[PDB]
C-alpha cells in the first residue's frame, strides 16, 4: 500500500471494519504500520482487531478440517486441504509477528504500547502452537510464553490491576497455560489472582472504566467456572 497516505489507510481500515471486510482491514493496517511511524492507541486496536478476525476465521476452519481428518483416521484430500488452510494461517501469523519485530516492539517505550504488542506476540505464537507438532511445537510454545511473561512483568510494574490490557493479557496467558502448556493449575491460579486483584481496585474507577474492567473480569470468571 506504499502509494496510499497513512491517514487514508487508517480511514479505510475503519470503513473495512464497518463493512466486515477484515482481510482488507488487515491489509490497510499492515500498510499503515509499514509507513514506519508509531501507532496510537486507537490505531493499535485497529491492527489487532483486523488480524484477530482474519486469523480467527482461519483457526475455526482449521479446527473443522482437523476434526474431519481425525475422524477419517479412526484419499489425500482432507489432509491436503487442512494443510492448505494451515499454511495460510501460519503465513498470517508470520506476517503479524514480522510487523511486531520490524519495528513496532522496539520503538514502543511506553508501557501501554509495549505491553499491547508483547501480548499480540504471545497470541500469534500461541496460534502457531495450536497447529504445530513435535519439537518445533516446543520452541514455538516457549516463544509464546516468553512474550507473555515479558508483557506480564511490565504490566504488573506499570499498570493498575484493572487496566483492560493488563486484564486481557492475563486472560490470554491463562488460556495459554490451560490449552497449550498443559498447566491447568497455573491457568486457574493466574485467572483467580488476576480477578481478585482487579476486584479490589474497582473502587478507584469511574463508571465507564468500571464497565471496561468488569467486562473482562467476567471472562476470567467464565473460564474459572469451566475449569473448576
Amino acid at each position: 500500500m506504499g502509494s496510499m497516505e497513512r491517514a487514508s489507510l487508517i480511514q479505510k481500515a475503519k470503513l473495512a471494519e464497518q463493512a466486515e471486510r477484515y482481510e482488507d482491514m488487515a491489509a490497510f493496517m499492515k500498510g499503515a504500520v509499514e509507513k514506519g511511524e508509531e501507532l496510537s492507541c486507537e490505531e493499535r486496536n485497529l491492527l489487532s482487531v483486523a488480524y484477530k478476525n482474519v486469523v480467527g476465521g482461519q483457526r475455526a476452519a482449521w479446527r473443522v478440517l482437523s476434526s474431519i481428518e481425525q475422524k477419517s483416521n479412526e484419499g489425500p484430500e482432507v489432509r491436503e486441504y487442512r494443510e492448505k488452510v494451515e499454511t495460510e494461517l501460519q503465513g498470517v501469523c508470520d506476517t503479524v509477528l514480522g510487523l511486531l519485530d520490524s519495528h513496532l516492539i522496539k520503538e514502543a517505550g511506553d508501557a501501554e504500547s509495549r505491553v499491547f504488542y508483547l501480548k499480540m506476540k504471545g497470541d500469534y505464537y500461541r496460534y502457531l502452537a495450536e497447529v504445530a507438532t513435535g519439537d518445533d511445537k516446543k520452541r514455538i510454545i516457549d516463544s509464546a510464553r516468553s512474550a507473555y511473561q515479558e508483557a506480564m512483568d511490565i504490566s504488573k510494574k506499570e499498570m493498575p490491576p484493572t487496566n483492560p490490557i493488563r486484564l486481557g493479557l492475563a486472560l490470554n496467558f491463562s488460556v495459554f497455560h490451560y490449552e497449550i502448556a498443559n498447566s491447568p493449575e497455573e491457568a486457574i491460579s493466574l485467572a483467580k489472582t488476576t480477578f481478585d486483584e482487579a476486584m479490589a481496585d474497582l473502587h478507584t474507577l469511574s463508571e465507564d472504566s468500571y464497565k471496561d474492567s468488569t467486562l473482562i473480569m467476567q471472562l476470567l470468571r467464565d473460564n474459572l467456572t469451566l475449569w473448576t
Binding site: 471494519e17 486507537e42 490470554n172 488460556v175 490449552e179 467464565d222 473460564n223
Partner: peptide, 9 residues
C-alpha cells in the same frame, strides 16, 4: 476456555 474475543474495535 475463552480468550479475549478481540474482534470489534
Amino acid at each position: 476456555a475463552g480468550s479475549i474475543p478481540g474482534r470489534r474495535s
